[PDB]
Amino acid sequence: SNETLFSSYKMGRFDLSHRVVLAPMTRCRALNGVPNAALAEYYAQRTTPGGFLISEGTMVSPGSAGFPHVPGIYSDEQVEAWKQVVEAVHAKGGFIFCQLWHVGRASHAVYQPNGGSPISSTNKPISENRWRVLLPDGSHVKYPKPRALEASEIPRVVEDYCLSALNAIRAGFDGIEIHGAHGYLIDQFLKDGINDRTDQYGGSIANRCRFLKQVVEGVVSAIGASKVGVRVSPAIDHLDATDSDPLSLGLAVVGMLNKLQGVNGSKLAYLHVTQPREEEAKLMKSLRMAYNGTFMSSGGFNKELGMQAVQQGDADLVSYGRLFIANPDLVSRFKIDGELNKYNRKTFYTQDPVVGYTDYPFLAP
Numbered sequence: 001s002n003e004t005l006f007s008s009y010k011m012g013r014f015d016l017s018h019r020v021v022l023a024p025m026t027r028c029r030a031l032n033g034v035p036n037a038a039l040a041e042y043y044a045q046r047t048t049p050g051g052f053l054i055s056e057g058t059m060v061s062p063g064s065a066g067f068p069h070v071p072g073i074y075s076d077e078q079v080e081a082w083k084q085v086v087e088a089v090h091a092k093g094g095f096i097f098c099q100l101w102h103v104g105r106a107s108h109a110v111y112q113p114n115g116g117s118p119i120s121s122t123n124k125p126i127s128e129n130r131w132r133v134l135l136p137d138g139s140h141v142k143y144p145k146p147r148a149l150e151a152s153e154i155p156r157v158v159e160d161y162c163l164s165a166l167n168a169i170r171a172g173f174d175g176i177e178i179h180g181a182h183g184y185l186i187d188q189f190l191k192d193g194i195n196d197r198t199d200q201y202g203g204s205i206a207n208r209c210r211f212l213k214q215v216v217e218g219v220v221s222a223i224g225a226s227k228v229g230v231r232v233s234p235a236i237d238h239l240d241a242t243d244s245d246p247l248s249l250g251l252a253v254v255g256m257l258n259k260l261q262g263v264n265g266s267k268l269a270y271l272h273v274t275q276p277r278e279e280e281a282k283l284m285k286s287l288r289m290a291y292n293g294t295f296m297s298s299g300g301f302n303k304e305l306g307m308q309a310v311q312q313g314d315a316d317l318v319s320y321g322r323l324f325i326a327n328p329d330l331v332s333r334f335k336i337d338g339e340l341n342k343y344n345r346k347t348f349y350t351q352d353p354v355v356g357y358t359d360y361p362f363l364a365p
């Protein structure tokens with residue numbers, strides 16, 4: 001087609017000016033779980049008129065975090081502190097979705113109420129050799145043994161997503177994204193690499209999708225489908241989050257979202273899928289073809305790959321992470337094929353409100 005990253009797009013009620021999306025990225029500047037003026041600056045710097053942004057993963061409940069200084073949206077105090085970020089984005093003409101993030105077993109007693117065990121689909125820990133939880137002192141230690149949720153406690157978790165989603169709207173977010181990716185709580189139910197349940201939430205593909213289904217249904221009922229994006233990564237093996245067949249899992253997720261869109265009358269805001277980064281683009285093309293709606297692809301995109309993803313109909317929208325970390329004006333830079341600042345990995349997850357956060361420079365004229 002003649003569509004590109006700079007073609008406008010209608011994401012339901014949201015009129016986007018372009019297809020470049022700020023991927024949700026944990027940066028750990030939200031000291032003590034509270035959004036602050038530093039996040040406001042950071043998101044404002046990255047906003048464009050009609051540009052879509054997705055927040056760093058945001059706690060839906062105490063115990064839902066597995067990184068230091070990540071924001072929450074479950075408490076009044078967080079809702080209020082988020083306003084400044086959201087106002088700052090809106091002042092600059094962006095839309096911002098709050099990513100509702102539950103890490104499940106990818107946590108530590110440090111991040112749990114009463115230093116209790118992280119919850120998950122399973123009682124099995126993330127394996128100890130490839131993965132670590134980052135603690136607030138900057139150490140990396142092994143993930144602990146989680147406590148499998150009883151089926152009876154799942155509706156309370158769903159309700160946390162709902163309250164958090166209602167809080168997000170309260171704070172002024174244009175909507176929310178369900179973080180159902182990357183081996184976190186939802187993905188711990190989704191993936192047969194993890195989900196060793198024998199009740200209604202495990203076994204079949206459908207059972208594995210049930211938690212995500214209830215989360216999405218719950219959030220969609222509370223705030224409206226058009227304000228809900230869903231993110232999944234069927235083929236990302238992060239935190240042991242494998243599946244014997246990513247394709248079919250992804251199609252089950254897609255199928256379930258197609259079904260919810262008929263059972264409810266409105267489209268979701270989007271399906272957001274991470275690429276692992278051949279066959280991979282076949283998996284992505286398949287999900288996008290299957291999904292009746294806006295498709296947001298993510299993972300390893302640069303401009304060129306983004307332009308072709310849009311041009312060739314592989315995606316409506318392309319989220320950028322690391323490039324957006326380092327390039328507040330990423331969209332402009334892409335538009336004029338200008339220089340790209342390099343990202344500094346070392347300050348991805350540090351705490352300074354400025355350093356490695358809001359101090360990556362805009363283009364010179």
Ligand SMILES: Cc1cc2nc3c(=O)[nH]c(=O)nc-3n(C[C@H](O)[C@H](O)[C@H](O)COP(=O)(O)O)c2cc1C
Pocket residue numbers: 023024025026027056057099101179181231274298299300301319320321322323348349
């Ligand atoms: C520092 C960092 C933190 C991230 N945190 C999140 C997150 O909180 N939620 C999420 O869904 N994805 C998260 N991701 C994944 C990104 O949203 C995005 O999928 C990723 O950066 C891949 O695209 P890229 O090559 O453009 O960086 C994170 C990525 C980075 C680099």
